[PDB]
């Protein structure tokens, strides 16, 4: 009782090529579903659509989420990370849960009274065989809060399974978490485990200083030839085939080694409202994929630059991670209440998401048939393509669990971060059934690896700076009410590398 | 663009010798290096390589919000800063302070 | 801003200067002091700041 089961650790040590970021928060776990595994479906909300159908179970267990970056990295550490380094990746994960406290609430007439419960336990288990469904990878809410002084609430755990409409099928699996061995903690006991990330490639934080089509030497002609003129001059029977040397004078027609990455086109919407037609096109005009009779919006999709150079206003409809500003409502908030992230860096090696991939020939030419081409709205992988993955943000997720299949291509998840077949295991928790709730201290510690910046660039880099101009309250800090706020999304790519 | 060191005039005393245009006041600065062409119309040419080893003091601070850092602008200028124009003329556009990171008083 | 300045020649007459052996010396750059009050940046101390020059800058006036 009177012996503390742990301490408070919250600092990042910078040692050589590795970073050690410890995060410790305080939590409050209520009792969900009154200790019941319950079925849920769309008919509870009515399921107005077929695309919205879901059939699943909701369990009393809660689960911890550190899966977003700003849990671990203070905005300063993140600056020191994005400025000086070309890449990073998690190595170790070390988790502790301690200083458990159990409080009972017995309502009597007006006031509710809250007293200790000494003999009560808190059941915790982590799935290290990954036999449960994995809900940590969808960018759900409920992660550890960014600011260390906050107190957060463990989100309820529930999962989904196969469905036709709201009905089940014979294959639908029902997992009872009580079937797993778990550990039980009283106020003096504490819980700890340690993890080791599987090998993942570095996340590359940098923006190329060369565009895929400018790789050439500007002073020297190629020895390849291209077809410059198909006619000498106006008239009948005037066709000719004339070849020229590929050189700086006509640069774009040179032969090249590699081609930009894939594209699946998105609609483009203008931050300026008056540049859009008066029609509802949010759902109807959105690029989406179809699975088993359901239409699923494509978000964000492949990594593609958001806009052509010079256009800040246009953004791909569903193709850009959008974050909320502090204190933004849930439903139909105006366009300046949310933060939009733009893929400016990927344009060099990646196509613009609102533009075509290119053109191809739609027929054979002849004297009777002109050359006819038509646009390419989507292009699968072709050998030789190079591309940049999607950027990760301070607010964005870290990892996902690769779906378990026979095959996949480039498992790196489309919302950013490190795709893994064995991510950090879920941590599930509940109160032991005897109104009761428990609190404690979560401490997560991750060890990161860093790829240092070797560049010989003579002129100074672009760095992430905090504007000096005076204002009513500092960025990334509390306000007079005490409400912590993150002004703008932060990308990881501020440095440069040769293509 | 400024100086590195300056020699402290050898005197009875001084107060805070650090020189006024900046840098490191020293009583035995790096020696002068004198050169001439031995008389025998004559001139000579060659290479000079100079190497100084600098020591650093790292930023340990616990400040939560981000620092003010020095950066390079991104607004499509005719020529990049700290680089050459079409005549091969290396131009330093603005002087750069050393003071960006923050400490407590 | 040229017009906030007095309409006279105060370049050497009005400047700060330490005197040595009957020979007046301008105080450049001077002791270490902030160049201006916060919020006003147009002004600068007369000799109190290292003044470099951009390339191509002439040697006079």
């Amino acid at each position, epitope marked *: 009782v009177g012996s503390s089961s742990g301490n408070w650790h919250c600092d990042s040590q910078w040692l050589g090529d590795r970073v050690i970021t410890t995060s410790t928060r305080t939590w409050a776990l209520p009792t969900y579903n009154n200790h019941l595994y319950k079925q849920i479906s769309n008919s509870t909300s009515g399921g107005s659509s077929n695309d919205n159908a879901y059939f699943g179970y909701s369990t009393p267990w809660g689960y911890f989420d550190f899966n977003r970056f700003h849990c671990h990295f203070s905005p300063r550490d993140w600056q020191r990370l994005i400025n000086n380094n070309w890449g990073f990746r998690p190595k170790r994960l070390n988790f502790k849960l301690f200083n458990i406290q159990v409080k009972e609430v017995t309502d009597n007439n007006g006031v509710k009274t809250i007293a200790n419960n000494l003999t009560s336990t808190v059941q915790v288990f982590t799935d290290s065989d990954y036999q449960l469904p994995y809900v940590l990878g969808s960018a759900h809410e409920g992660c550890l809060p960014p600011f260390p002084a906050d107190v957060f609430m463990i989100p309820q755990y529930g999962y989904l399974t196969l469905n036709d409409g709201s009905q089940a099928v014979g294959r639908s699996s029902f997992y009872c978490l009580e079937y797993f061995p778990s550990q039980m903690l009283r106020t003096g006991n504490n819980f700890q485990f340690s993890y080791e990330f599987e090998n993942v490639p570095f996340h590359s934080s940098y923006a190329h200083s060369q565009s895929l089509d400018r790789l050439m030497n500007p002073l020297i002609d190629q020895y390849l030839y291209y077809l410059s003129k198909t006619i000498n001059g106006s008239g009948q029977n005037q066709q000719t085939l004339k070849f020229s040397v590929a050189g700086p004078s006509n640069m774009a027609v040179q032969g090249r080694n590699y081609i930009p990455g894939p594209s699946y086109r998105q609609q483009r919407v203008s931050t300026t409202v008056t540049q859009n037609n008066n029609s509802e096109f949010a759902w109807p005009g959105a690029s989406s994929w179809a699975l088993n009779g359901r239409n699923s919006l494509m978000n964000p999709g492949p990594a593609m630059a958001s806009h052509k150079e010079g256009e800040d206003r246009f953004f791909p409809l569903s193709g850009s991670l959008i974050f909320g500003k502090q204190g933004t409502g849930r439903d139909n908030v105006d366009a300046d209440k949310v933060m939009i992230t733009n893929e400016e860096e990927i344009k060099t090696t990646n196509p613009v998401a609102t533009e075509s991939y290119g053109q191809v020939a739609t027929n054979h030419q002849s004297a009777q048939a002109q050359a006819q081409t038509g646009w390419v709205q989507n292009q699968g992988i072709l050998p030789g393509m190079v591309w940049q993955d999607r950027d990760v943000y301070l607010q964005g997720p870290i990892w996902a669990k690769i779906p378990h299949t026979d095959g996949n291509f480039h498992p790196s998840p489309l919302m950013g971060g490190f795709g893994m077949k064995h991510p950090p295991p879920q941590i599930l928790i509940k109160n032991t059934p005897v109104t009761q709730y428990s609190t404690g201290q979560v401490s997560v510690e991750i060890e990161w690896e860093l790829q240092k910046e070797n560049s010989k660039r003579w002129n100074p880099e672009i760095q992430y700076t905090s504007n000096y101009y005076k204002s009513n309250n500092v960025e990334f800090a509390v306000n007079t009410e005490g409400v912590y706020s993150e002004p703008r999304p932060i990308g990881t790519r501020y440095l440069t590398r040769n293509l | 663009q400024g100086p590195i060191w300056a020699k402290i005039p050898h005197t009875d005393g001084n107060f805070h010798p650090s020189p006024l245009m900046g840098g490191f006041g020293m009583k035995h600065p790096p020696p002068q290096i004198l050169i001439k062409n031995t008389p025998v119309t004559q001139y000579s040419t060659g290479q000079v390589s100079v190497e100084i080893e600098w020591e650093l003091q790292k930023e340990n601070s616990k400040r939560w919000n981000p620092e003010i850092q020095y950066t390079s*602008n991104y607004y499509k200028s005719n020529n990049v800063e700290f680089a050459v124009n079409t005549e091969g003329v290396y131009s330093e*556009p*603005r002087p750069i302070g050393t003071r960006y990171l923050t400490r407590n008083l | *801003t040229v017009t906030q300045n007095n309409n006279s020649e105060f370049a050497w007459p009005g400047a700060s200067s330490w005197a040595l052996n009957g020979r007046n010396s301008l105080m450049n750059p001077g002791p270490a002091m902030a160049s201006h009050k916060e919020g*006003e940046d147009r002004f600068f101390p007369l000799s109190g700041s290292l003044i470099f020059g951009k390339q191509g800058t002439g040697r006079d006036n």
Partner: antibody
Amino acid sequence: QVQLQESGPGLVKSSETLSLTCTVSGESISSSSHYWGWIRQPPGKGLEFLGNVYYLGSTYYNPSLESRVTILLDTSKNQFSLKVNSVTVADTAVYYCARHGAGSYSGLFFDYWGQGARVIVSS
Amino acid sequence: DIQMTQSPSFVSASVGDRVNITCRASQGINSWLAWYQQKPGKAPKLLIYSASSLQSGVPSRFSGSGSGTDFTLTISTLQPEDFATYYCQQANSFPYTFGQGTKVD
């Protein structure tokens, strides 16, 4: 050559803040060492100075305007923004951006001018 | 503030005929002036800076010499290309003030 473009809303509700921005192409505000300033032309009338902003961020405002105007200097994107508060029907005209300086006459005469920006304050 | 009054408010003078526009500062401006030219709807463009110094872009025809309380812009050999209002500006003391306008025909 210095080209100056203004952008922002062309209609603002009365007692709503007005915001324009001038993105200067052809120079670099941080290293040009010139003053940048605004003036306004109420229709069919003489232009009246609003204020200017020196490249280090210092700012002068016109006392006639009573502490409404605020000129922010965003040096990295190479543009500076005018913001005037509690707009009224009277405060509607074409707002010109200008480079306030030259070698001899810096922060005095306006040599290079914006294309102009119409703003109509209305209810 | 310092008032500025251009004496002709509307001067109708046709092609070839010499024109002179005069604007008097309320108080001595120590020969700091700036005549401008505004063709309808476009932004004005500078013509004469200080007292008599012509701008690089402007044609030799424009000229003017102020005595410091009195100023004149003489458009000599007026060509049809310019029929526009003309403003003057004080540089002497804040706030800078553009008096009225002189519309020429």
